[PDB]
Symmetry: C7
Subunit: 261 residues, 7 copies
């Protein structure tokens, strides 16, 4: 598993969940996302009914609608970022685990036979496939696209969120539209939206790292073949290879040394 | 266990539980699902009694009834999705575990004997049964049907939920129907229903993936026999087979190689 | 341990605990199970005293009494379902564990001796006892009876719960019967009863599966002896038998194969 | 450890802790165990002071006193039931663990010597002691006595609890006895007592099982010596004896069988 | 580690922590330990200020002062009981662990040499020291003294707690001594003190067991030397000695038996 | 991993998370970060609306804006400090783990060959690279820079926070700007800012340790090459080297000793 | 690790964290640390604003300022006590672990060679260094100094805390200094300060043990060299030495015994 992309993924997941959990902790801290005026004649309950009404009224200036739903959309993005990892955890990971374990021992046998090519034949045959490299391309890029719409959404959010912290709510509705004690609209403040707009900029800012970093992961001709992706697995899993390290030190140095190694 | 279908199942379970837990966290965040007006003359308690009354009144426009019960119905679907896995965990899983473990060693003996057919006789005998393939068909499809009614329910919910966010509640009832201070009906907002209608669309949208994906799992003639289902277990459990990987690399390459392998 | 009956048991326990925990979570969500009117002249506390009074008044139309106690009765059923498993975990499980472990090795010796009858003598002697089969019958059926009264209770509950969501409560009592500001009865809504009546139907519906399923477990002549119950342990614990699987494959196929097996 | 008595003990502990925890969860759910009227002129705080006063007044019709303290007395019984197990866990358990482990191997040597008496000499010497059997008698019976007083207490509780759900509380006390706005007594409802009286009957009912069951455990002449208690350990720990099972099967069947066994 | 004294210690720690945690759970359940009257003219906040004031006023009839601090003093005793175990866990436990492990193998060698005295020389040399026995005496007795003052404190508490459930509080203080709307004293009820006085009697009653039991642990001449304390470790750690059990059975019976043993 | 720098890092992370968690616990303890006056004519809800309004108004004297966002900025710094460790955990840690494990065994072979140079050739070749030392420099310094801006931010915060604990808030806004009952501005206290300003000084003070300590970590010429960084890994991982310790003791002492060693 | 000093440290850390956590639990129990009067004309919110204002006003008789910040200063001391252990865990612990493990085996070889001096040469060379003994001196003493200022702080706290439980707060400030309904100062009670002053005395009292105990740890000439500190490690880690125990028993007794040992 490619660590940076994995770490980027792990971090990309941590941020919103943190933000969401804190928003929840803040929603737990605030208790409501909105409030409105009332007449002072509105009882302690009557005003509570207004607040809850307008909090419900949101689904009927369009961002004012979205402003309520904003946090859960974030959660949607978080889930949408996570699942490609579980998907990728099966698109390719079951293949490579077998691949590496084979690759290791045959190169160790190349190493061992040198001390005293089936993986190369296999690997330069994996060269033939475009399937698993395109598996990587699609799985990563799709995940990347999740970030794009979030950032665009957060941008389209933030840009207009800056001007739409408040609205006037009517609860003069139905039969109790006829109650004149209800002002035709209450003015209402979308309490969390400033936090969210801040949170939005925060997440957006950090996500503006993750996007081109994953883009950087595709410049493999400068980092076209599964081999080139195996070369990533090489650049990756050299991590696993004692004999490579030994032979790389040998290569660094260059049967006595092999006898000493 | 078929990973995608398993993952689909694991995910299909995660979503509603997440949605339900957040709805609970939201119910914990909101504290009530409904409120109503009162006269300002209704005490801080008297108005509370109205709210609770109408929250109870729900069981006596029919979706307004269902709107209350909505979340727990979701929980019902979640349980209804889970149990087929535990059921399937015994319909077939005890069979295949023994099957695979047998299949492995005899094909390894085919492999070993080749290096220096009982599973094939067994497998091409499993070809005879329709019982375990029909076990799969029913167990999966039933689980799939759980999704169907949920989505239909959420659709029948959402389509009319869009118009029925509120109602007028009468608590002028019994002896205290005679109290004229009680308005014959209070107007009442079904606070969570917008969230739920959103949540409904969310779950519906994601479930509209899971359904045809499981449908795709049945196109085995393009992915009629337990063997064909064993061919799935083949396409599955090749995951387990060192010698297959070795022989597939051998097959990729093709006694020296067997001696080297 | 018979998986379906065990799973049925595990599930039969999960449902009410879930329902109860959610009812608790709902009781935590609602904070009270009941409320009543008051005069508006009843203070914010005075009305609270009414509510709590009537919530206490329940123990003095009889289901209105029971309606309060309803949840804990559910908990009673849940405990009553659980303990037969712990009881059964000792009525028979210590016997069979020794039985199976003996049975395995001697049939493996039959298997081994065939490759190159004490369990049969023992098993066809276990044929003599009615004690352990009657242990099963009673332990299961008793557990089953727990379900019967619950469902009957929930039915007797639900059928009249449908009509008795509310009552009028008198707190004009004792010395403070003489306070005329207290209405001779307050009208009172049994807030949770609708949820409970829903919950009751839910649990009842699901329990109407578990009952005849366990009944189906007794049709052993179509699924009279401990052997017949050992035949269940056979139909069960063939799960454990490598050699049975081998010999069943051998039986499927039919010393070379035994030499190959 | 004698499973039924142990299970009975484990269950006997589970019930009250469950009841207590739920009572706590109910105390958490209710927030107070009592309330009283007030004049409506008593402030939202002044009435709160009454409630808390009378909740404190309890220590100065005697069961009304006890009714408050009731739950913690239950907790007392629960602790009082638990500790005899820890006590018994040392009164006898360190002895028998060594005893069984010795007994096993020497009877296995009797078994082994038969294949190709020190425990019997030891056991029929343990016959001499009355100390460890009286250790059992006292430790169990004492635990049993805990149940007796609880049930008697719950009975003496329940029988009069049925009539004493409420009382009149005076907070006209000290200097602020002179405040005439305070009614000489407030009427007060002991909110939890109905639950507790229910809980009391529940626990009592279930404890009326546990008592005679433990009594049944003493009818050893029909289930006088440590041997007879070792015969219980026999009837118990035959659970541990492979060779007994083998020899019991041999005994069931009856050197070839010993050679086969 | 001496089990009874250890168990006594473990239990002696469990009780107050339980009582304290429940008091906390009760403090969490009650929310305040005290309340007072107010004029009804005192606002919902003004009366709250009184309550909190008098709750603070406690530090300026002396037990009324202590009554507030009571719970944490209990916590003090609990910590004060615990730490001697950690202290004792190093005063002696590192010595004896080495001692026992040595003692075992040399007596096993006495046992083994008998089959086919250094510990006795060592032990009857440990006879010389008074240091480690006085380590026990002081460490235990000190712990015991913690109990004494608690019980005395609880007694001095309880005896006067019985008469001092309430007091009159002045918040007519400082500049706002000049506000005549403040009554020169409010009457105030020390809400938890009844629970605490109950709790005090409870803990006292149970601690009146633990004290003389530990006293009973010192009657070693009837249960003067480290050997006598080693004789306790003997009476203790015979628990560890296979060969003692074997030789005690041998001693019970009395080279064939040694050959059989 | 360099322990001090690691410990410094671990501690540098612990402090703010502690401060943040306590601020959250304090936000949980306070429930709001701000409040304002109202007219007494503002209802219990109307004043609540003011408070929440002004709490939202923050995003429209600039530090008053920032004062709200302050805590989450701290959280930002905490995350910003953490991730360089995970980054560094891959920038270098996969290299050195292989390096050390190689280095150990070859120096042990130097040790072993001495008893009866490939690592030196490798290490004095690592001398060639500037890549991994610059990896350290950048990764640490960047982390260090996180501290700089925090401290500067906290300074720019604290210095002006000292004068800007409060502000006047206008909620006379929109349509409900026209309500004259609303004072054109409410005066508002930024409740947490004193805690935060304290917290700021606290964190700043402690961070003024961590900064130059990490600076001290760069004075390697007094603590220019990867070798010099390997000399740190030497000064570090001598921790791992038995033979170094042995040979250092040998070096301390100086084939008999090697034969004795 | 020196157990007493370690235990002293572990305990020294436990106490404040306990006190702090309980203070938090008390802050959670109280909900506020302060309250003030208001005019009764101050709304339920207006008075709340006063309370929060004065709670914020603290940062502008100086101990009244500190009284708020008191708990977190305790937390500061707790952290300040902890970190020297982690520091010491690296100042010396990595050295001694290697030291002991070497020391053991060479003295075991002295033991073994005696049965049939490199550590002594090493140890009496460690005699040369003052570095690691001064490491101990500074690390411990610094930790000790943390206690000093806390106790002094708590003393300077307690001594004046005794007289400064309350103050008068002005919220007549800014524009809303001009509101005459605000009393020029409210009188305010620093609710927690009595608990804290109690807590302060508690912690101080217990810390007055820990200080001279650690002082007692320095009287090594009566408990000047690393050897003398190794003699502590001797007096310490004799805990680890089987052969020392054996040879100490041998020394207690004094090749047969060595042959028997």
């Amino acid at each position: 598993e490619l660590a940076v992309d994995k770490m980027v993924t792990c971090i990309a997941v941590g941020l919103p969940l943190l933000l969401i959990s804190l928003a929840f902790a803040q929603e737990i801290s605030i208790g409501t996302q909105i409030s409105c005026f009332s007449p002072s004649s509105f009882s302690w309950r009557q005003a509570a009914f207004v607040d809850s009404y307008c909090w419900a009224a949101v689904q009927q200036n369009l961002p004012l609608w979205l402003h309520k739903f904003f946090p859960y959309i974030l959660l949607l993005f978080a889930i949408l970022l996570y699942l490609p990892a579980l998907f990728w955890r099966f698109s390719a990971a079951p293949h490579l685990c077998s691949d590496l374990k084979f690759i290791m021992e045959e190169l160790d046998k190349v190493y061992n036979r040198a001390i005293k090519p089936i993986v190369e034949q296999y690997l330069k045959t994996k060269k033939n496939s475009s399937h698993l490299i395109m598996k990587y391309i699609s799985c990563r890029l799709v995940t990347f696209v999740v970030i794009l719409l979030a950032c665009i959404y957060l941008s389209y959010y933030f840009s207009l969120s800056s001007l739409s912290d408040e609205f006037l709510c009517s609860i003069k509705s139905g039969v109790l539209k006829n109650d004149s004690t209800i002002p035709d609209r209450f003015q209402c403040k979308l309490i969390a939206v400033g936090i969210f707009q801040l949170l939005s900029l925060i997440n957006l800012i950090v996500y503006a790292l993750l996007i081109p970093v994953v883009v950087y992961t595709f410049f493999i001709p400068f980092r076209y073949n599964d081999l080139s992706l195996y070369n990533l697995f090489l650049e990756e899993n050299i991590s696993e290879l004692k004999s490579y390290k030994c032979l790389k030190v040998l290569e660094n140095i260059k049967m006595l040394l092999l006898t000493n190694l």
